[PDB]
Amino acid sequence: AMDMKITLFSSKPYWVKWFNELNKFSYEINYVTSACDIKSVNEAKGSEAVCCFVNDDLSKEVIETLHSNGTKVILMRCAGFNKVDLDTANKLGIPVLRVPAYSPNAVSEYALSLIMALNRKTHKAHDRVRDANFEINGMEGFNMVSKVYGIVGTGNIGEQLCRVLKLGFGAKVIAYDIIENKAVTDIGIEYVKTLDEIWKQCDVISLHTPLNSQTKYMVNSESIEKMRDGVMIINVSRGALVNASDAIVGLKSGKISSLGMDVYENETDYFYQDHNGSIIKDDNLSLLISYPNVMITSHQAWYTKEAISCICGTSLQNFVDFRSNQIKKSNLVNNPISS
Amino acid sequence: AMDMKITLFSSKPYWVKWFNELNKFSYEINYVTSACDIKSVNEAKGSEAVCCFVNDDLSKEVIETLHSNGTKVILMRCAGFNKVDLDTANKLGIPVLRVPAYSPNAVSEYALSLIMALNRKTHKAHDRVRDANFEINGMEGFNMVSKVYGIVGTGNIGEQLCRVLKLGFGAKVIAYDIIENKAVTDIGIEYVKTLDEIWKQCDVISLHTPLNSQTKYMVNSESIEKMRDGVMIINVSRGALVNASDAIVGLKSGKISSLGMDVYENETDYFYQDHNGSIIKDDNLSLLISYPNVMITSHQAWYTKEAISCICGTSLQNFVDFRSNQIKKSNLVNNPISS
Numbered sequence A, B: 001a002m003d004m005k006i007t008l009f010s011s012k013p014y015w016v017k018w019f020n021e022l023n024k025f026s027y028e029i030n031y032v033t034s035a036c037d038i039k040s041v042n043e044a045k046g047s048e049a050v051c052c053f054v055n056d057d058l059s060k061e062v063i064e065t066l067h068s069n070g071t072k073v074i075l076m077r078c079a080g081f082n083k084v085d086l087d088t089a090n091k092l093g094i095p096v097l098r099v100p101a102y103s104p105n106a107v108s109e110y111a112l113s114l115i116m117a118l119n120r121k122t123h124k125a126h127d128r129v130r131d132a133n134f135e136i137n138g139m140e141g142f143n144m145v146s147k148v149y150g151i152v153g154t155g156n157i158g159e160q161l162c163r164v165l166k167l168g169f170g171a172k173v174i175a176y177d178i179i180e181n182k183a184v185t186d187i188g189i190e191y192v193k194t195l196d197e198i199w200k201q202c203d204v205i206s207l208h209t210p211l212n213s214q215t216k217y218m219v220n221s222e223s224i225e226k227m228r229d230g231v232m233i234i235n236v237s238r239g240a241l242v243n244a245s246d247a248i249v250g251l252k253s254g255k256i257s258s259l260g261m262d263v264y265e266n267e268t269d270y271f272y273q274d275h276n277g278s279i280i281k282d283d284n285l286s287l288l289i290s291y292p293n294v295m296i297t298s299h300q301a302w303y304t305k306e307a308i309s310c311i312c313g314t315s316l317q318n319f320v321d322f323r324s325n326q327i328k329k330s331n332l333v334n335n336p337i338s339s
Helices: A013-022 A060-068 A086-091 A104-120 A122-130 A156-169 A195-201 A221-226 A244-253 A283-290 A305-323 B013-022 B060-068 B086-091 B104-120 B122-130 B156-169 B195-201 B221-226 B244-253 B283-290 B305-324
Strands: A005-008 A028-031 A049-052 A073-076 A148-152 A172-176 A204-207 A231-235 A256-261 A294-296 B005-008 B028-031 B049-052 B073-076 B148-152 B172-176 B204-207 B231-235 B256-261 B294-296
Touching (some): A013 A028, A013 A305, A049 A305, A060 A086, A073 A305, A104 A122, A104 A204, A104 A231, A104 A256, A104 A294, A104 A305, A104 B104, A104 B122, A122 B104, A122 B122, A122 B294, A156 A172, A156 B156, A195 A221, A221 A244, A283 B122, B013 B028, B013 B305, B049 B305, B060 B086, B073 B305, B104 B156, B104 B204, B104 B231, B104 B256, B104 B294, B104 B305, B148 B156, B148 B195, B156 B172, B172 B195, B195 B221, B244 B283, B283 B294
Parallel strands (some): A005 A049, A049 A073, A148 A172, A148 A204, A204 A231, A231 A256, A256 A294, B005 B028, B005 B049, B049 B073, B148 B172, B148 B204, B256 B294
C-alpha cells in the first residue's frame, strides 16, 4: 500500500541500520543508493513519502514527477533544504518535514575534536607512527587554558561549546550574537558588541551562526587581516561562512595558524561520496585538503549514536505525524496550501 | 669554563630552541644528537653537567666515565630515570636532579585528545579525505556524556582529567586510588574500592598510576575478560601498565573497541627516532600501530609550549641550584653521599 511506503534516496549503510532499527511502525522502506534526481525519481513511484538528504535534487520537475506518481510528503532527514523547490511543493500541497536541529552535544564535541586535533596533532602523529617515524618535532601544542576562545553564534550548539571550554578547561571565552543567551551569561561569559572585538581578542574562533547575506564570507581578507597572528579557525556550521580563497591566503602567510572545517561552500559534488581516483576539480578544496595545518571533514559532526538516532527517529515520527494530521510547526519547512 | 658547561644528549630542535631561550645564566651548552651511551659519553668530557632524557644510557660504565672526565651533576630533563644507574651516581657523589612532574593540563588534555580521536575518528576522516574519499560510514561516534569513565590513579594528571570529564561534559566519572584526592571527591566523583569495579562499570578507562610490581600488566587477559564489551582504554602514563599481547587479543575479539597509548613497554628502541625504512622488529608494536582502532604516539603528552618551557626551565634552575648548593629535595632523585 502506497500510504505505508517510504523511498529513501541517497541511502547508505548507516541510514539502513538506523531507520530499520527505529521503524517500529511497520512502514515499508525502499532504500535507493542513487541521489534523488530526474533520472532516479521513478524509483519513488507509489511511495506516499520520500526521505531525502542534503544533496538530493528536489527540483521543480522532480517534485512534479513525485506528485504525479503518488508521493504526498517529503521527509528531509536533515535541517537543510536549499535543493528543495519549496514553491513547487507548496503549489502541489506537499509538506516538507525536516529535522530542525542536531544534538548540540554531538556537534559541539566535534568542533572540540577539531580543536584538539589541530592543537595536539594526533592525526599527524598517527600518520608519522604508521610510517615508523616516531619523531615529534612539529607537534608542539598548547594548554587549552592558554588561549582566548571566541564563539560566534550562541544557539544551542555554540552554548554547549561555551560550557565545555569555560567549565571544562576554565578557559576565557568571549561570545558574539545579536541575541544574548542567558545560559552563557550565567556561567560568566562576556558578549562583545562587534565582530571586530572577536577578531581582536580571540586566539581560537569557532563559528556557529546560520548562513545568510550578513554572515556569508564572515571570514575573508578584511576580517582575516584584523585577526590575531596565529589564529585558529573552526567551522562546523556552514561552508560559506568562510571565503576559502581568502583563508588560503591567510594560511600561506601564517596569519591563520590552522583551519578546521566540517563543511565547505561547494560540498555538494564531494561530501559523502568516495571520489578516490578522480581529480577534485575545485582547486580551493584540493589545496585546503593538501595543507598540513588544515582539516576538512565531510560534514560528520552529527554522526554519533545518539544524534543519528534522533535524526532517523524524528524523520519517522514526521511521517507518523503526517499520516495522523498532527504535523509539528517546528518541523514544517514550507507552506503546502495547494494553489 | 668547565663548571659552567652542560652537555645535552639526545638533542632535538625543540630542546635547542627552549634551552637557548631560557638560558639566562651564561651557561655554555654543547648539544649532542647522539643518545648518551658508552660510545658518545666522551662528548661530555670537561662538562660539569650532563642533561639527559628518557632514552639516554646512564649505565655504571657511562657514569664512571662521566665522572672520570669531570662531570659533577646529572640533569634529567624528565620525570623518569629507569636507565640511570643511581647506585653508581651515589657512589661517585653525583646528584641526579630531575623534573618531578609535567604540566597536568598538558598530559590530561593529551589523554582527552586520544579519547576524542578514537571516538570521533578525526584522523581516520583526515586520511580518507586526503584520498578524496568523503565517505563517512565507519565513523560513528558517541556523545561524551553517554559513557562512564574510570580514572585509575588520581594524582594531579588524573585529577585534571576527572575535572574536564565531569565539569566539562557532565559525564559520570568513577575513580580508583588507595589515596583519595579531596579535589576529586569535592566535585562529586565516587571512588570504588577495587579495580574490579572499574572493569565492571566503565566504558572508557584512562590509566594514571605509576608503574610498579602491583600495577604492571594491570591490563591483561584476566582484567580484559572482566571489562565491558567495547571498552575504550587510554594509557598516557607508563607502557607496561598494559600487556600488549593480551591487549591485541582483546582488540581482535572486539572486547576492546579501541586503545590509545602515548607510551609503550618497549619504547626505548623506537620513540623520538625516525625509523622509516627499517622494519619494526617488535611484532606487538608493529601489530598495534597497524590496527585501525589503535593510536600509538611517541610519548608527546607533555609537549605543549607551557609544559616544555617548565621542563627546560626547571632543568636549568636545577643547575643553578647545584652550583649555589641549594638543591631542592623534591628534584633530587638519588643519595649522592660518595663512598
